[PDB]
Design a protein around this ligand. Structure first.
Ligand SMILES: [Mg+2]
Ligand SMILES: [Mg+2]
Ligand SMILES: [Mg+2]
Ligand SMILES: [Mg+2]
Ligand SMILES: [Mg+2]
Ligand SMILES: [Mg+2]
Ligand SMILES: [Mg+2]
Ligand SMILES: [Mg+2]
Ligand SMILES: [Mg+2]
Ligand SMILES: [Mg+2]
Ligand SMILES: [Mg+2]
Ligand SMILES: [Zn+2]
Lengths: 94, 101, 148, 37, 50, 94, 86, 120, 177, 99
RNA sequence: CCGAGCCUGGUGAUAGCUGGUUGUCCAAGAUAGAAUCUUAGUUCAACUUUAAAUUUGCCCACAGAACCCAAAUCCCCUUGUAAAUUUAACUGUUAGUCCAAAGAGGAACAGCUCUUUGGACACUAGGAAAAAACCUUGUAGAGAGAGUAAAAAAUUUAACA
């Protein structure tokens, strides 16, 4: 299991909806998605960064081809941050 | 030769270490250690008590055959040599830092 | 030569080092001849050293055919299904001892050019570089030379 | 060629390196001897 | 020219380098150059040289 | 346009090489090292007569060792063991 | 890079030359046992030992030669005294 | 024509400014030279080449010890431009037989008899 | 990081639209900066095999300035291919006929001589004056600074600077001036 | 023959690539490679160019920390150029003595 | 296909001349000249090579080496080093180019020719643009290590009582 990341082991649909319902479980504000940086909006290979802000403070951001893909990727990042399966997490002890 | 390594990662070394495969060893020299929010630099290398980097030997193998040809033109000077160097594989099992600072 | 010869990235079988290390050589199959000056070294080796070798390596299994053969050979099967045969024709006892021991130490995957001398499945800590890491933002995120 | 020539015989690179190192660097104080004194 | 050769702040002079042979420059030089130190090159005469 | 006669680094007319501060500073540091060598070669420790006859014994011993090594030349020895071991080519199991 | 700085400070021009960056052991057993010395360090130690032996040999030879010169001049003085006695 | 050059003896007479510069006391002079070959013996005459291998400087940047005596200073003058010379000075006294092993050079010409390879 | 593979790769090797104003800036170092940004050396993930180039937009190439009498001394020369087709034009003539060609040629020279030079010159963009098409100034990121500052003129020096600057000499009153 | 002679140009090309990458990151953080590496050596960190480039890529925070270290060492060296002695040595310019 | 036919044979004519000369790996190794119907070759010397015997071989410190009309050299104990001489057996090199220096010839021309000292090339590598001969640099491999070597030209010029 070491190499494989979480959303590569476990498939999800509507990850931003999952994130919203989890934040409602935790009783925090519904976050809003806002693009932070972008380049090539008119270009055929655009690049966007979408951050998810709860109570006007960011907890996750994600890159993407389009705004929607960047948004769902940022939701995925937030889910990783919550569940503690980040790539910067403590390795498995032996 | 300097490497950067983490846990559960492989490295290859161009010589044999006189160690049975599967055996664990502690790496003494450490030029640097770093986490997501901080880093520890040496002058040049860090203290022994500070770090604990452990690596297990996985494999000892002859490198793929390297050809070397020496050729000089219109002098009838041509020669081949095919060499296979020994090389060993290590896996970094664990990295730990001490409260000492 | 590298371009004619195939290549591969460094990798291990089942991440052999993390948990318990395992002897990745399943099996050895010697084929030696009773007669034949070529096989005298192999015969002496199977006489004296192979015993202690098997005692040292219980996980591996050793088969000896001992049939007529002009060239004595040795086959080695690994966990990966990789087969590797070497001809020990006119080879001394210590030579084939080193040969067998390095076969045991070897991993069951082809020896060919290795691109990188390392492998990090989690290379990125502190975040991988992207163009927008080391440049600041703008008030209200305004592009250069735009009113609103 | 000969040592003595009508033209100025081109010298060896080390020779002209030496001649380019050895010069009369005119010494004067940091202050010009007209404006200040 | 005498006060020039006395006043040059350059620590290095053709006299010194040639009479010492500190870089094997005797290869490139002539045996007469150590007396024709810098002023001469063949028939010519470069007074600015010292 | 811009060519020059013959080979460009030999003959009556050749390509004019020019010096640079790089070369100047390099050679002046070399001859600075050489001047330090002059200084250290000055200031001897002993004189000729003090230096005359102290290493004669060592030089004599070295030369006598060379003499012995040169005189000590013979064929190697021959052994019944190394002659008979060739019989072991027809070894075979009963 | 920085070779002149290292020399001015007293360190080797190349950090690979000498110092703790290379002379220390690069690995030890996890049990804390010491590993055997590396071949490079072994040959460097042998070289340094021969170096020191040669230094000592030269110093001893030359100071013995100077002492021999001294006592020869002393014997010369003594035999001049003997002459003036004769 | 090119021939091996004789050096005037007056060249090797240090002045007080040179003494104050290089830190060499004419009284109580050193006795051992460390020598390191800096330039290629190639593109040099056979006498320089053979004197180099005589002194034992066939490899470059490999320090060799020699005596500070005229018979050796002669060769060192012949090939002074191929080599760097510095004195050998040590505070810890000559290496004893117990400390033959743990010796160490320094780039400053020092020869230390104990090498703890550890900071203060 | 905690990013997925393809989006992380995309964000890492994405292209950037740099913007530069050439108002009295020299085409030499303008093209230097542009060539660096186009080759992708500024990216620490640079490798020639990987096309890590970036788009660049220059403005006011008409209002560029040389150092010296370059406008007269410099000559851009080209051969049409036919006999008598060898023609030289001073930078002044070449600017008057095409204000973009000077910086274009400067960059074409700074760039390496491989087949990627033409692609990088395609990614590049030039505009004679302060005007950009909507999409092109919409898909921008940042304006990297100019290499040289522009010295101030007398009509620009405020009065307090002039007053703070001291007077250096006293004229005699009897003088026409 | 070209396979065997390609090894040295492999070494050279990869060093040139490491230096290019480090120069890029350095001028991205305001510095440049000569000053950066000189100051690192002065502060006694012998981190070769391959790991420096790998840190520039995968670990930009550590790399810009090192660049800040280098720049501060530059400013300390300039203070030393102003007054060589007769002053307190830089806190980072200090060296560790080995024996 | 007649300055004297063609076929066969001698005849595998001869050729100091041209061309060609077959498996792997390692090592040592370009060298003053003389005679010759001889200068496109050869014999001797010299150099190189192999195996042996013995001891001095190289660097060199004072002293020493012409009246006539300079760089350096010969000899040379010490010292630093490890080579040298002789014996035995051959082969091969004996049509050579540039740089620096001293000269001769020629025009104080030649990428010109002739002698001497040294270096390089005809062996690898980096540089000077490509480059035989210039500068750094030599003893052999693997490295995705590091310190260095030689190494990038500067110049704008004329008033006058
Ligand atoms: Mg001449
Ligand atoms: Mg030509
Ligand atoms: Mg006829
Ligand atoms: Mg007919
Ligand atoms: Mg014939
Ligand atoms: Mg032929
Ligand atoms: Mg050889
Ligand atoms: Mg002939
Ligand atoms: Mg003698
Ligand atoms: Mg000629
Ligand atoms: Mg000629
Ligand atoms: Zn003034």
């Amino acid at each position: 299991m070491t190499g494989k990341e979480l959303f590569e082991m476990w498939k999800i649909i509507n990850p931003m909806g999952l994130l919203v319902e989890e934040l409602k479980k935790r009783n925090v504000s519904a976050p809003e998605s806002r693009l932070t940086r972008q380049s090539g909006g008119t270009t055929a290979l655009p690049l966007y960064f979408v951050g998810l802000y709860c109570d006007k403070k960011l907890i996750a951001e994600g890159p993407g081809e389009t705004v929607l893909v960047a948004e769902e990727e940022a939701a995925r990042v937030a889910l990783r941050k919550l569940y503690g399966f980040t790539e910067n997490r403590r390795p498995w002890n032996y | 030769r300097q490497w950067k390594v983490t846990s559960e990662d492989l490295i290859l070394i161009g010589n044999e270490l006189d160690l049975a495969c599967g055996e664990r060893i502690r790496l003494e020299k450490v030029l640097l250690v770093g986490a997501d929010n901080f880093t520890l630099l040496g002058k040049p290398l860090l203290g022994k008590d500070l770090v604990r980097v452990e690596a297990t030997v996985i494999e000892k193998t002859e490198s793929w055959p390297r050809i070397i040809m020496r050729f000089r033109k219109r002098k009838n000077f041509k020669k081949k040599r095919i060499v296979t160097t020994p090389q060993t594989v290590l896996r970094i099992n664990s990295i730990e830092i001490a409260p000492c600072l | 030569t590298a371009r004619g010869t195939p290549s591969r990235f460094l990798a291990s079988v089942l991440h052999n080092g993390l948990g318990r290390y395992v002897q990745q050589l399943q099996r050895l199959s010697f084929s030696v001849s009773r007669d034949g000056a070529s096989s005298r070294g192999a015969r002496e080796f199977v006489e004296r050293e192979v015993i202690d070798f098997a005692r040292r390596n219980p996980g591996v299994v050793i088969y000896v055919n001992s049939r007529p053969c002009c060239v004595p050979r040795v086959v080695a099967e690994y966990l990966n299904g990789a087969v590797r045969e070497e001809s020990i024709h006119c080879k001394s006892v210590e030579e084939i001892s080193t040969l067998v021991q390095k076969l045991a130490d070897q991993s069951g995957l082809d020896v060919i050019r290795i691109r990188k001398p390392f492998h990090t499945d989690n290379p990125s800590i502190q975040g991988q570089w992207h163009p927008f890491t080391n440049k600041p933002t703008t008030f209200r995120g305004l592009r250069p030379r735009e009113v609103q | 060629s000969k040592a003595v020539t009508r033209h100025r015989r081109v010298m060896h690179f080390q020779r002209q390196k030496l001649m380019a190192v050895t010069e009369y660097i005119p010494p004067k104080p940091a202050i010009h001897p007209s404006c200040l004194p | 020219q005498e006060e020039r050769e006395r006043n040059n702040q350059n620590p290095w002079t053709f006299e010194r380098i040639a009479t010492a042979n500190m870089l094997g420059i005797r290869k490139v030089l002539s045996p007469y150059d150590l007396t024709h130190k810098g002023k001469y090159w063949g028939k010519f005469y470069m007074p600015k040289r010292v | 346009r811009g060519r020059i006669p013959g080979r460009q680094w030999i003959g009556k007319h050749r390509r004019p090489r020019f010096v640079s501060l790089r070369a100047k500073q390099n050679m002046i540091r070399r001859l600075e090292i050489e001047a330090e060598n002059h200084y250290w070669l000055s200031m001897p420790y002993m004189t000729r007569e003090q230096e005359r006859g102290h290493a004669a014994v060592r030089r004599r011993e070295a030369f006598e060792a060379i003499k012995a090594a040169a005189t000590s030349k013979f064929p190697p020895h021959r052994f019944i063991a190394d002659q008979l071991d060739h019989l072991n080519v027809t070894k075979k199991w009963s | 890079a920085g070779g002149q700085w290292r020399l001015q400070q007293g360190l080797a021009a190349n950090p690979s030359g000498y110092g703790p960056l290379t002379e220390l052991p690069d690995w030890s057993y996890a049990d804390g046992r010491p590993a055997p010395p590396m071949k490079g360090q072994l040959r460097r130690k042998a070289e340094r030992e021969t170096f020191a032996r040669r230094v000592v040999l030269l110093s001893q030879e030359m100071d013995a030669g100077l002492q021999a010169w001294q006592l020869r001049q002393q014997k010369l003085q003594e035999e001049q005294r003997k002459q003036e006695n004769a | 024509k090119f021939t091996r050059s004789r050096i005037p003896e007056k060249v090797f007479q240090a002045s007080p400014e040179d003494h104050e510069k290089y830190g060499g006391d004419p009284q109580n002079p050193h006795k051992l030279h460390i020598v390191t070959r800096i330039k290629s013996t190639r593109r040099r005459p056979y006498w320089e080449k053979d004197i180099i291998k005589m002194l034992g400087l066939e490899k470059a940047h490999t320090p060799q010890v020699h005596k500070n005596i005229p018979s050796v200073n002669a060769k060192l003058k012949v090939v002074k431009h191929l080599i760097r010379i510095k004195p050998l000075k040590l505070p810890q006294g000559l290496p004893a037989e117990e400390n033959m092993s743990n010796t160490c050079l320094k780039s400053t010409g020092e020869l230390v008899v104990q090498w703890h390879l550890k900071p203060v | 990081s905690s990013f997925s593979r393809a989006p992380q790769q995309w964000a890492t090797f994405a292209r950037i639209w740099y913007l530069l104003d050439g108002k009295m800036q020299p085409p030499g170092k303008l093209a230097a900066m542009a060539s660096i940004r186009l080759q992708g050396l500024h990216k620490p993930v640079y490798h020639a095999l990987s096309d890590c180039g970036d788009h660049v937009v220059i403005m006011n190439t008409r209002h560029i300035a040389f150092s010296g009498n370059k406008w007269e001394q410099k000559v851009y020369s080209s051969h049409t291919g036919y006999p008598g087709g060898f023609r030289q034009v001073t930078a002044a003539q070449l600017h008057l006929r095409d204000p973009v060609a000077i910086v274009k040629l400067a960059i074409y020279g700074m760039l390496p001589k491989n087949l990627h030079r033409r692609t990088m010159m395609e990614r590049l963009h030039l505009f004679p004056d302060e005007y950009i098409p909507e999409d092109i100034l919409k898909n921008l990121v940042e304006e990297l600074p100019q290499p040289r500052k522009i010295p101030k003129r007398l009509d620009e020096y405020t009065q307090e600077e002039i007053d703070a600057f001291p007077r250096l000499w006293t004229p005699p009153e009897d003088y026409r001036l | 023959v070209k396979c065997t002679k390609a090894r040295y140009l492999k070494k050279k090309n990869m060093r040139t690539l490491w230096i290019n990458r480090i120069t890029a990151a350095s001028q991205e953080h305001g510095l440049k490679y000569p000053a950066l590496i000189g100051n690192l050596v002065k502060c006694q960190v012998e981190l070769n160019r391959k790991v420096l480039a790998d840190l520039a890529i995968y670990e930009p925070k550590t790399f810009k920390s090192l660049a800040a270290l280098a720049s501060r060492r530059r400013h300390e060296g300039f203070a030393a150029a102003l007054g060589d002695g007769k002053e307190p040595e830089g806190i980072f310019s200090r060296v560790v003595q080995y024996h």
